[PDB]
Amino acid sequence: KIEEGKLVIWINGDKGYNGLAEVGKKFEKDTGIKVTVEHPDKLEEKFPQVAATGDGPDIIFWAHDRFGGYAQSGLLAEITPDKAFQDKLYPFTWDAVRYNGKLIAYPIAVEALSLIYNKDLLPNPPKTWEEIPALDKELKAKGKSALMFNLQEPYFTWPLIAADGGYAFKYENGKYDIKDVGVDNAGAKAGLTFLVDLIKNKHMNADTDYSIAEAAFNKGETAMTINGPWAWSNIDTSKVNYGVTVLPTFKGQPSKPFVGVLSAGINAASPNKELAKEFLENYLLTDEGLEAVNKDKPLGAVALKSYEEELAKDPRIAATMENAQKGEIMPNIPQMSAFWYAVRTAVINAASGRQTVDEALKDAQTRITK
Template sequence: MKKFLVIALLVVSLVVLAQPKLTIWCSEKQVDILQKLGEEFKAKYGVEVEVQYVNFQDIKSKFLTAAPEGQGADIIVGAHDWVGELAVNGLIEPIPNFSDLKNFYETALNAFSYGGKLYGIPYAMEAIALIYNKDYVPEPPKTMDELIEIAKQIDEEFGGEVRGFITSAAEFYYIAPFIFGYGGYVFKQTEKGLDVNDIGLANEGAIKGVKLLKRLVDEGILDPSDNYQIMDSMFREGQAAMIINGPWAIKAYKDAGIDYGVAPIPDLEPGVPARPFVGVQGFMVNAKSPNKLLAIEFLTSFIAKKETMYRIYLGDPRLPSRKDVLELVKDNPDVVGFTLSAANGIPMPNVPQMAAVWAAMNDALNLVVNGKATVEEALKNAVERIKAQIQ
C-alpha cells in the first residue's frame, strides 16, 4: 500500500512538472492587462501564462533568432507588417477559422493575412482621420468638395491667419487615402497574397488621387511646403481649422485646449470613401513552439472574445479590431472617428518590399506639388524606381 502511494505521488509530481506553460512577449503597454488575463486563464484551465516585457523594437529580431531553434515565446504581440517575413520563414502558425472571426473588421483580418491564410489575432488598429477645430468647423464635411469650399471660406475670412485645411503635402502616408480611394494600390492583392511585381501607384486611380492633391495646391488650399510639423503646430495653436492626422496627436490637442472633433476623411466624391493606410497590432503564434496548439486555443477561445478584447482595450486604449467592442466604447467620439476611418482603410503591405516604396513616392509627390513634373510622369518614374529597388 505504501509502495502504491509513493508511485501515485510520483505520477502526480511528473504531471505537475510537465504541465505546459505559455510564454508571451509583448511591449510595455500590454504587460499589466495580459498578466491579469493570464492569471484568469490559469485559474480556469490550469495552464500558467508568463508575460515577459520586451522592447517593441526588439520583439521581432529576438523572435527571429529564437524561434527557428524552437525557443523564445509561444506567442508574440506585434505589428501586422511583420507577418510576411515571419510567415515566409515558417516561424508563425496559421490561425484556423473560428466562430468569432465574423465580428472583426475585415481590414484588421486582412492585415494579418498572408497567402490566403490568417496568421494572427488582431486587437487594435491605427489610422489617420480628419481632425477639425469646432470653433471654425462645427460639423465635419462629408466630401472633399465640401472641405475645399469650407477651407476657402476660412482662408478668405481670416486672411491667412487661420488656414482652412492643412496636411503633409508631399508625404505618401498622408496622401495615400486619395490614391487608394480612387483605386490605386501599392501591391496587387491576389488569392496567394500580395504580388510585389504588380504595382498600382501609376494606374488611373493613383493618377486621379494625386490630381486631387494637385488641385488643393493649385487652388491655394495647400502650400507645397506644408509638412507634418507645420500642420501639427498650427492646429495646436488654433491656426488651422482642419487637418489629417492620427490618434497619436490627440493628447497634445487636448492639452492645448482645442475644441476638436474626429471624423473619417471626407469622401473623395459622393460614395467614394478615402482609404488611409492602416496599421494593426495583434497576437501571433510561434510555429516551432511545442505548445502551439495550446497557444492557438488560448487566442481563439479566450483572447479573441468580445469581453476579453474590451478589457484589453481598457488596459491599452487603441482603436478596437472588433466591431462589437466599438459599440461598447461609442461614448468616446475620438475612438469612433478614428475606427470608422480605419475600417475604410487599406492595411500597410506586410511584406519587406514595402521599404522600397516610401522614398520613391515622397519624391514623386514633391515633384508634383512643386510643379516640376506632371502627375503621370512623376508616378511612372516612381513605379520604375520601386521595381528596380525590389529587383
C-alpha cells in the first residue's frame, strides 16, 4: 500500500533534498497534498525491494542507467509528457530515459567528466590529446606533470577510448543492440593504445587512482586533471585558480565521456501518478523549482533548456554540458554489468602490461558476449 493523498519522494544524500522539500511545500500550498522527501542509504537497491511488493516512494530520483532495470522489472510507470513539454528539455536527455521505446522517467540533471586545469600552471589548456606528451615534457622539468587522472576505473578512461570509435552498445533508435559492442574495434584500440603510450613515455602512472589523482591537483602537483562537478567543492576549498573546459580531442574527434542523467521516475504501484507528473512537470522542472534545489546543493548541468542557459553563465556548467553533448549516453540495459568489469580489467591489463592492447580488448568483448 502506497498512501493516497500524498507524494513520497526518494533522492540521494548528495542532492539538495531540503531544497526539494521547499518545492514540495510550494506544491502543497497550491494542492493541499503534502510531499515527504527522504534520502535513505542505498535507495538504488532499496527501491527494487520495496517497489516489487507494491510499495516504496511514489517518485524516485536516480541516474537513468539504473532505471532501465526498474522498467524491465515492471516497477516504473510509463510517463506521458506532451510534445510542448518535451521541447523544454535537451532532446538527447530523452534518449536516456526510454526503455522499450516508451519514456519511463523525467530528465533532471546532466552529469559528465570535463578537463579541469590549473590557471597558474597552464593558462591555456590543450584542445588535443596528441599534444599532452609535449606539455608534460615542459612541465616535468619544473617538477610537475601535465595530466593526472584515475586510470584504474574504466569510467574515467572511456572518454579517450571511445573518442576514435569506441562505444558500449550501439543505439538503433529507441533500443540498444546487445550483439553490437564497440570495445573490440579500431576506435577503442586506438584510444587504449594512446593511453598506454602516455604511461610508456612516463607521462602518466599505470596505477593512479581517483584519490591519488585528486590530491595532486588540489596541491598543484599536476597541471590538469579530468573529473566531474562533484569534485569542484574540493578545489574551491584549495583556493586553486582553476578552470573547467571541454575535454581534449583525439584523432580529430572529441572525447566521448559517459553521460549520467539524473532522472525522476514514477512508481508503477503508485496511485498518485497524476499527482506526481503534475508536481514534476509544473513545479520541479521550472526555473524557480530547479533553482530551489540548486540553491541547496548545486545540480551542475540541467536538462531544462531555460535554466541551463542561466547556469551556463558559469563556464564550468557550460563545459560539462558541452562534454555531455558530445558524450555517450550510458546504456540503461542490464548488460552494462559485463561491460564495467571487462573494460576495467582490459584497461588494467594493458596499463599493467599483462596483456597487449589488442588481446586485452578482444577478450573484454568476448566477456560481454555469450
